[PDB]
Amino acid sequence: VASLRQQVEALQGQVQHLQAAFSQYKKVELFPNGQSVGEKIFKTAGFVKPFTEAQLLCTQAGGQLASPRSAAENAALQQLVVAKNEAAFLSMTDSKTEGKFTYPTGESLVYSNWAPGEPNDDGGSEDCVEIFTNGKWNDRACGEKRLVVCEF
Amino acid sequence: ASLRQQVEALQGQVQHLQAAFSQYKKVELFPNGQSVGEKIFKTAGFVKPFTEAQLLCTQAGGQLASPRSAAENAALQQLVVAKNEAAFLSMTDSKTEGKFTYPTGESLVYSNWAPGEPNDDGGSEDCVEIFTNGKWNDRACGEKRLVVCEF
Amino acid sequence: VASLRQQVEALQGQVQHLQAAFSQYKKVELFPNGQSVGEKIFKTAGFVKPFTEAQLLCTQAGGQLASPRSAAENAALQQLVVAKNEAAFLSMTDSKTEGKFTYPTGESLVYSNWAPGEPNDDGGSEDCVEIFTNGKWNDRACGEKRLVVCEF
Ligand SMILES: OC[C@H]1O[C@H](O)[C@@H](O)[C@@H](O)[C@@H]1O
Numbered sequence: 434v435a436s437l438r439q440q441v442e443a444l445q446g447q448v449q450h451l452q453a454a455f456s457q458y459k460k461v462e463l464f465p466n467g468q469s470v471g472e473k474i475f476k477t478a479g480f481v482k483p484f485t486e487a488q489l490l491c492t493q494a495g496g497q498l499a500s501p502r503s504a505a506e507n508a509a510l511q512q513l514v515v516a517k518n519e520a521a522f523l524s525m526t527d528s529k530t531e532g533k534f535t536y537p538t539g540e541s542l543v544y545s546n547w548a549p550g551e552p553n554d555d556g557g558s559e560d561c562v563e564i565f566t567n568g569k570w571n572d573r574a575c576g577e578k579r580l581v582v583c584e585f
Numbered sequence: 586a587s588l589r590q591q592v593e594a595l596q597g598q599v600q601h602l603q604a605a606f607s608q609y610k611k612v613e614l615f616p617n618g619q620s621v622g623e624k625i626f627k628t629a630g631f632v633k634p635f636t637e638a639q640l641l642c643t644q645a646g647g648q649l650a651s652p653r654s655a656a657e658n659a660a661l662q663q664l665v666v667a668k669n670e671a672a673f674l675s676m677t678d679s680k681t682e683g684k685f686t687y688p689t690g691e692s693l694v695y696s697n698w699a700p701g702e703p704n705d706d707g708g709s710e711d712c713v714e715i716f717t718n719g720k721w722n723d724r725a726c727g728e729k730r731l732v733v734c735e736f
Numbered sequence: 737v738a739s740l741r742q743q744v745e746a747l748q749g750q751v752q753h754l755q756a757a758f759s760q761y762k763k764v765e766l767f768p769n770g771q772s773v774g775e776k777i778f779k780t781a782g783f784v785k786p787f788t789e790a791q792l793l794c795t796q797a798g799g800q801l802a803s804p805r806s807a808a809e810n811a812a813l814q815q816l817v818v819a820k821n822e823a824a825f826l827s828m829t830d831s832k833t834e835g836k837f838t839y840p841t842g843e844s845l846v847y848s849n850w851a852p853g854e855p856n857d858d859g860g861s862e863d864c865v866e867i868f869t870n871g872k873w874n875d876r877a878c879g880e881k882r883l884v885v886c887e888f
């Protein structure tokens with residue numbers, strides 16, 4: 434009772450100090466290659482890779498390629514693209530059904546920010562998606578190399 | 586009694602978090618960070634002009650490196666030495682020439698000026714850079730220097 | 737009692753939040769320069785340095801140069817070497833007694849993965865160890881510059 438109470442007050446002090454230390458370290462971690470938005474975190478590897486290799490890096494790391502599902506998420510991702518000045522690959526593709534872009538899960542897009550005229554499947558072989566420094570999207574060949582950005 | 590059990594369970598979970606966190610703090614700081622007291626300095630690894638550098642730090646939830654003691658200055662110096670690139674500090678005398686202040690407007694509580702500095706060379710040096718030897722020199726804000734933020 | 741009960745529930749909520757937030761943060765931290773194996777974490781600095789310099793960097797960081805003690809640890813370390821496509825230095829040397837490799841403490845090796853014919857003290861001057869992209873080890877001159885990888 435009395436012992437338990439003070440034991441609770443003591444443990445909470447420890448937990449709140451931990452919350453403070455963690456919050457500080459989270460900010461430190463995100464600088465300068467990450468961006469937090471909502472409960473999602475985007476982080477770039479700082480280099481470019483073809484889609485398949487980029488996808489594998491994110492999955493092996495316990496996440497997946499950047500999948501902006503709102504204007505806010507797209508804006509956060511855009512910050513990293515602008516910072517590295519390198520267009521990045523998104524996770525979505527229309528490899529299964531041409532013209533129908535989906536997330537790795539197979540779910541259809543719930544948000545899109547296609548540049549005017551896109552997606553055009555240029556050359557009849559653009560099944561991956563890249564995001565430019567202006568935040569707009571363009572379908573591009575999966576074999577091209579683009580900035581690797583994962584979401585966790 | 587049920588609460589007693591819950592408390593003992595929480596103690597074990599907290600001990601685990603503390604141990605795991607302790608390890609990750611060391612991992613995080615390697616190789617671009619420095620912890621001194623309750624402050625953490627971290628470099629972006631590249632150079633930028635003052636305004637750009639300042640914005641990067643502020644948007645990241647911190648501010649440009651602002652050593653307030655010899656200890657903090659020495660810690661910051663370690664990053665500068667490691668990257669072999671002089672860095673910008675947060676302080677400027679842009680408001681009133683000759684009076685350097687922190688982004689808040691507060692006057693300096695510590696400084697490590699090289700002899701003869703600040704000298705407002707060319708009548709246009711309102712920013713501050715820190716050398717690999719830890720000394721400070723006022724320099725043009727337009728120059729590009731290592732970006733180091735504090736959190 | 738009743739109050740203590742409400743506070744314990746609040747504390748429980750705080751700890752659960754931290755467990756979830758910390759787990760996410762760990763994945764973010766490790767991407768793309770770290771590898772977790774068991775209770776050990778390997779992290780590369782992303783650049784090369786001669787042995788002495790690399791060794792000092794790790795020690796000052798509160799850790800030490802990569803010291804794989806099992807096939808599992810060696811495989812984890814190998815992932816970073818492959819990722820950076822740069823051979824890395826291990827912590828072990830035979831500087832004290834030629835022909836006898838030891839950890840920084842002085843203890844004899846508990847595991848090794850030498851390439852065929854190694855260690856061979858080529859030129860009578862190889863007292864350090866490098867790990868290749870294939871995971872095998874080779875003794876090499878300590879003055880050479882190799883990928884810096886520390887363990888924490
Ligand atoms: O290089 C491919 C690229 O070429 C142009 O920029 C446009 O036609 C794009 O739609 C297309 O993706």
Ligand SMILES: OC[C@H]1O[C@H](O)[C@@H](O)[C@@H](O)[C@@H]1O
Nearest residue numbers: 702704706710722723724725
């Ligand atoms: O250090 C002497 C002098 O050298 C250059 O002119 C600049 O770096 C000045 O800021 C400095 O004051």
Ligand SMILES: OC[C@H]1O[C@H](O)[C@@H](O)[C@@H](O)[C@@H]1O
Nearest residue numbers: 854856858862874875876877
């Ligand atoms: O042929 C093997 C031999 O090649 C070179 O001489 C060096 O890399 C040596 O360390 C290695 O033992």
Ligand SMILES: [Ca+2]
Nearest residue numbers: 462612613765
């Ligand atoms: Ca980190």
Ligand SMILES: [Ca+2]
Nearest residue numbers: 528531558560
């Ligand atoms: Ca197609």
Ligand SMILES: [Ca+2]
Nearest residue numbers: 527554559560
């Ligand atoms: Ca297509």
Ligand SMILES: [Ca+2]
Nearest residue numbers: 553555571572
């Ligand atoms: Ca296109």
Ligand SMILES: [Ca+2]
Nearest residue numbers: 678679682711
């Ligand atoms: Ca002035």
Ligand SMILES: [Ca+2]
Nearest residue numbers: 678705710711
């Ligand atoms: Ca001035």
Ligand SMILES: [Ca+2]
Nearest residue numbers: 704706722723
């Ligand atoms: Ca000057």
Ligand SMILES: [Ca+2]
Nearest residue numbers: 830831834863
């Ligand atoms: Ca020898």
Ligand SMILES: [Ca+2]
Nearest residue numbers: 830857862863
């Ligand atoms: Ca030898």
Ligand SMILES: [Ca+2]
Nearest residue numbers: 856858874875
């Ligand atoms: Ca050899």
